[PDB]
Ligand binder design. Structure first.
Ligand SMILES: CC(C)CN(C[C@@H](O)[C@H](Cc1ccccc1)NC(=O)O[C@H]1CO[C@H]2OCC[C@H]21)S(=O)(=O)c1ccc(N)cc1
Lengths: 99, 99
């Protein structure tokens, strides 16, 4: 699709089988979600933003689906105020920023 | 321009006359710049990012130019780990996400 930015670019994604409202976020290097439970081993990571840092769990090889597209990649899970799909996933599906 | 997302979408912008590299950040409502001095009056404000609130100075009616495009808007000056252009500016210059 071709999504303009007059409002927040929010879409419904299925991540690990769960429906989550997500922001398509070119400022996010990696996908970060708050409200999800993913199974198995994870690695401890941290992310940095405006106001400070968030500790996150990194889950690898997760199925991410939205807007008819499908990708597999890592998901950082933690107390973020916004659920974002970042460039780790958007690059994989050929998403570009255009004007 | 067509900007891929396999790397950070960083462009050179002129913001109130000042040349600065900035991140095109679709997940930011607002344009937040740390590395800038802007003249004139400003409004004290607090904005929340991923780690909570930070104090910024809001400058209004700033001319922002990048990649053969121009828009006028507000700039928040304050601490951020990346100088970001938000939707306040990107929506005015017809920026779209495409995939
Ligand atoms: C500041 C960016 C370099 C990084 N952020 C992505 C960014 O798009 C966040 C995404 C975001 C969105 C809402 C709340 C927190 C974070 N937006 C943001 O901080 O915007 C602020 C300026 O405009 C305002 O509008 C929204 C918050 C304010 S981030 O959330 O900290 C972030 C950092 C790393 C990862 N992997 C994922 C996300």
């Amino acid at each position: 699709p071709q999504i303009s930015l007059w409002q927040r670019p929010v879409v419904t994604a299925r991540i690990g089988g769960q429906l989550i409202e997500v922001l398509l976020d070119t400022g996010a290097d990696d996908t970060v979600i708050e409200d999800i439970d993913l199974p198995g081993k994870w690695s401890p990571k941290m992310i940095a933003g405006i106001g400070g840092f968030v500790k996150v769990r990194q889950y690898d090889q997760i199925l991410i689906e939205f807007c008819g597209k499908k990708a597999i990649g890592s998901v950082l899970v933690g107390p973020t105020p916004a659920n974002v799909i970042g460039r780790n996933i958007m690059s994989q599906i050929g998403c570009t920023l255009n004007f």
